[model samples]
Target: PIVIKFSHVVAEHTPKGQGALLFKKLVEERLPGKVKVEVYPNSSLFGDGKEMEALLLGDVQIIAPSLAKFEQYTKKLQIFDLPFLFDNIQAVDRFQQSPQGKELLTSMQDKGITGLGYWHNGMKQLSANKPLREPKDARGLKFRVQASKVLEEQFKAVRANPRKMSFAEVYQGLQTGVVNGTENPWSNIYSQKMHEVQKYITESDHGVLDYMVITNTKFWNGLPEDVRGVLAKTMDEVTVEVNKQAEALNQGDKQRIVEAKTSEIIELTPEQRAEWRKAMQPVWKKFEGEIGADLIKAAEAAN
Candidate 1:
């Protein structure tokens, strides 16, 4: 039997974590005696910084890193990191299903990575110790952000300092005031218990937090034809389920945070959201050379 190991850094209840488990069950059911799947959740197997290297070395067969992490492998992916790139998660889904979006799945093949599909974690919201209605309100604050140049620039555009930190460290960082704020989907904010330490969460819906399921190019292409067919089909099925649950989970978790009353959820008026959007707009032009103006336009059209 062929053994396949799937790894990610979130808890077992997250959208990505649930998807990983489902993939293992379906693959094992379909291939019975021919394949075995092992799942590692909560960074137990490999954390954010080490997972990519593990994937490339063929130590792990599958990983679904956030789109932000792909910048070193391909600049085109920076489009996803562009603040307010998609009006909503639905528009993001439309764009990803388009021909141009499908092309990105293979964009890193030359670099030995192959994107299988996209999984949603939902749109991001701003959280901090104080209510933030306008972009200016965030000035002088420090925000924990992923290792994405565009994200760093997004904060800089708003006059806030962006600190790159691993997902595992955000909770402690937030508690200790190592970082004053951060942006994340409601589900992530809840699952990580960040709301306990945060005083305010603004429903900015300013960005998307999604992941690209990828595998080592050589390892994937070398799989037996029959096994590859089953794996691909299983992945598609699981992606749909994960994305659907992501929306529900985020909404439910948002309510959970509200009931806990550990943090305040700030609702942004339409005009206020626009003000925030305009503040971060400069970041789009800053990376146009690497991300392609046409691609950015395509994403906008999805809205």
Candidate 2:
């Protein structure tokens, strides 16, 4: 029997966590006595910052890290981090299914990891100590961000300092004033109890929080062709189910935040959302060369 270790950095109830568990069930159920999967949720095996390195080093058989975290390996992945690149989760789903997206998944093979499938979580919402109703309101604030340079530049465009940290550190970073704000999908914000520490939660939907399932390149190639076939097919099937679950999570979890009243929720009218986008449009052009103008166009077309 072959044993696989899957590690991630989210609570057990998170979409990623649920998806990982589901994959384990499906794989083991079909490959009984042939393969076993061990699931590690909530940074139990490796912290957010270390999971990819662990995968590269062959310490873990599989990991699902956020797209932004791939910037260090290849700037091309930064395309996903571009602010407002995705109008909504459905647009993102379309872009991921496009040829451009397929190329992206394979692009990482040169870096010692193989991208398998993209798993959707939800769209990111801006949360801060004050209502971020305008672009200028973000100025001078420090924000917690993933390791993407695109994200750093986005905050810089608004004059906010971008602080890179592991997901495990976000709550403490917010509570101790180390970071004035952070962005996350409603599911993550609620699961992490970030809403309890922050004063405002804005329904930005400006970015999507998606992760790619990856495995050590060598390990993946070493698998029997038949084993690899089953694993890939299973992941592809689960990706669709996970995306639908993500949509439900977005609807239900955001409502939970509002009902809890731990933080004031900020809903933007169309005019207000347009005003905010107008303020952020410059960032799109600023990184066009790095993110590939054609890809950007493709994303917009899908939108």
Candidate 3:
């Protein structure tokens, strides 16, 4: 039997984990005794710091890293990191189906990786020990972020300092005030218990917490044609099911955060969201050339 080890950094309840599980279920059922899929969630197999290298070395067959993590290897993905690039899940949905989005997914081919699909978590919200109702409020605050140059610049644009840290380290970072604030979807915030130490949570929904389902290019290419076909078909179906559940899962988590009352949730009005957008939107113009102007335009035109 062929063994496929799937590793990811989030909890089993998050979209990334659920999608991985679904892929395992479908692929194994279709492929039957010929294949076995081992699902490792919450970074148990290899933490976020080591999983990508492990995949490259063929230690793991699959990994789903947050989209922002690809920025170091390909600036093309920085387009996704740009604040407000996606106005809503619908816009993101359209973009991911567009040619530009599909192309971006495969942009890492030279780095020896192949993207199978994209999984949605939800739009990210900004949170902190202090209220950030306005963009200016972020000034001088230290924020933790996934690996993305665009994120570094995004924070810099508003005079906020951005620090790169692993997902597992966020809570302690927040609790000790190593960083004053950070951003994440409600699922992550609540799952990681970040909301407990954070005094406020803003509802900007300015960025996405999406993941790319990828595997080592060489390992993927070496698979039998029939095996490849079955896996690809299964992944496509799983992506649809996972994305459909994303919004509601995140919404439910947000409600729990409200009930817990550990952190105050600040819902942004249309006017307030626009205010935050206006302040940081210039980052798009600044990085358009680096990220491909045509690609940015294509995403903007998606919906």
Candidate 4:
């Protein structure tokens, strides 16, 4: 029998966490006596900074880190972190299904990692201790961001300080005021209780925060053909369910947050949203050389 362990950093109720559990459930049911799957949620197995290393070292069989986490393996993925690159989750879906997007799944195979599929977490919204109706509102505030250069640039473009921190530490960071604000989907904000600490959440919908389910290339290639085939097919089924749940989850959580009234949700006017986009869109040009102009054009075409 083969032992497969799936580890992730979010709470079990989140979309990615639910996806991991579903993967385990379906795979085990299909493979029966030939396979066993274990799941570790809330970073119990490994935190964001260490999960990738664990995968590379064979300490874990599978992990689904955010797209931003792959910067070290492939610069092309930085495209996802580009501010305002994706107009909405629908645009993100379209792009990920495109030829250029599908090609990114294998972009890190040479680096010993292989992507199975992309899982949605929905588009990101900005949250801070104060109202943020305009891009200038973020100035001078320290924002916790992922480890991607484009994310760092996204904050810097708004004249905000961007601090790189692990996903598990964000709640405390926000509570303790180590960082004054951050960006995430509604599901993430509510799941992690970030909304409790944040005074305001701007409905920016500026970017997507999706995950790429990945495994070690060598380990995956060495698997029995039947086992590998079953796993691949199961992932496709789970990806669809996860993506569908992501949209509903975000909407539901947004309503939940409104009920709790812990954080005020700020809706942006079309003109105001355009101002925010124009302010931060320059980051795209800064990274165009690294992510390929053609790829940027392809993503834009999705909108």
- List of clashing residue pairs for candidate 3: none
Q: Model 4, 188-282: lDDT tens per residue?
A: 89989999999999999998899999999999999999899999999999999999989998999999999987889999999999999999999
User: Which scores better on TM-score, 1 or 3?
Assistant: 1
Worst 10 residues of 3 by lDDT: 71-80
List residue ranges in candidate 4 displaced over 4 A. Answer: none
The sequence of per-residue lDDT tens digits that candidate 3 reaches over residues 251-296 is 9899999999788988888998898888888888888888888888
Q: List candidate 2 segments past 4 Å from native.
A: none
Clashes of 1: 0
Ranking by lDDT: 1, 4, 3, 2
CA lDDT of 292 in candidate 3?
85
Alpha carbon deviation, residue 241, candidate 1 (Å): 0.8
lDDT of each structure? 0.93, 0.87, 0.89, 0.93
Worst 10 residues of 4 by lDDT: 82-91
Candidate 2 achieves a global lDDT of 0.87
- Please, what's the RMSD in Å of model 1? 0.9
Clash numbers, per candidate? 0, 0, 0, 0
Error of 3 at 172 (Å): 1.4
Which residue pairs does candidate 1 place in steric collision? none
